[PDB]
Amino acid sequence: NPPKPFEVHESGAYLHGTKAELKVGDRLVPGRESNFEAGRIMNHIYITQTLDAAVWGAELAAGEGRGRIFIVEPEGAIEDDPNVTDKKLPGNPTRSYRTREPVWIVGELTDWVGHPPEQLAAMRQGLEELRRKGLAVIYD
């Protein structure tokens, strides 16, 4: 399924893109290393209700694996991801959220296609440019 930017599914189910080999049944607590800043300990887990965002999460995750999209259930409260809320577009059209509490892995999505390679390379090259200019501010 070719991700359409800002398109929710009728489930409203929480998604999580990553390269981590997670399994159905896993409970995962906050505090892993950031995908964007070596050595940065995370206060939150990031989740999304759009397929587009979860694909970005699978493609941009650190690791040698192939991207995976997990279906997750938070144990506690979620809030708008500030990294993508009112930062260009008003509100939270990617429907990206974060939580200070653990999440359970309740399934895996298997029939999705990632972004065209020139889109993923453009995203990676833009992020390296914000790195080099010291404009890659990450809120957590």
Ligand X SMILES: CO[C@H]1/C=C/O[C@@]2(C)Oc3c(C)c(O)c4c(O)c(c(/C=N/N5CCN(C)CC5)c(O)c4c3C2=O)NC(=O)/C(C)=C\C=C\[C@H](C)[C@H](O)[C@@H](C)[C@@H](O)[C@@H](C)[C@H](OC(C)=O)[C@@H]1C
Ligand Y SMILES: Nc1[nH]c2ccc(Cl)cc2c(=O)c1-c1ccccc1
Segment (H or E) for 131: helix 117-132
Q: Is 130 near ligand X (CB under 6 A)?
A: yes
* 22 CB-near residues (< 8 Å, 6+ apart): 16, 28, 68, 70, 105, 108
Residue in 3, 14, 15, 46 binding ligand Y, rule: CB under 6 A: 46
Site for ligand Y in 59-118 (CB under 6 A): 60-61, 83
Q: Please give the size of the binding site for ligand X, defined by CB under 6 A.
A: 21
Q: Answer whether 62's CB lies under 8 Å from 35's CB.
A: yes
Q: In the complex with ligand Y, which residue's Cβ is closer, 9 or 40?
A: 40
Q: Find the shortest distance in angstroms from Cβ 138 to ligand X.
A: 5
* Of residues 25 and 79, the one with the C-beta less far from ligand X: 79
List C-alpha distances in Å: 39 to 25, 46, 115, 135, 136. 28, 18, 28, 18, 15
Per-residue x/- marks for ligand X, 43-72, CB under 6 A?
A: ----------x--xx--x------------
Tally of CB atoms within 10 A around 108: 12
Tell the smallest beta-carbon distance from residue 111 to ligand Y (Å): 20
Q: Is 5 in the site for ligand X (CB under 6 A)?
A: yes
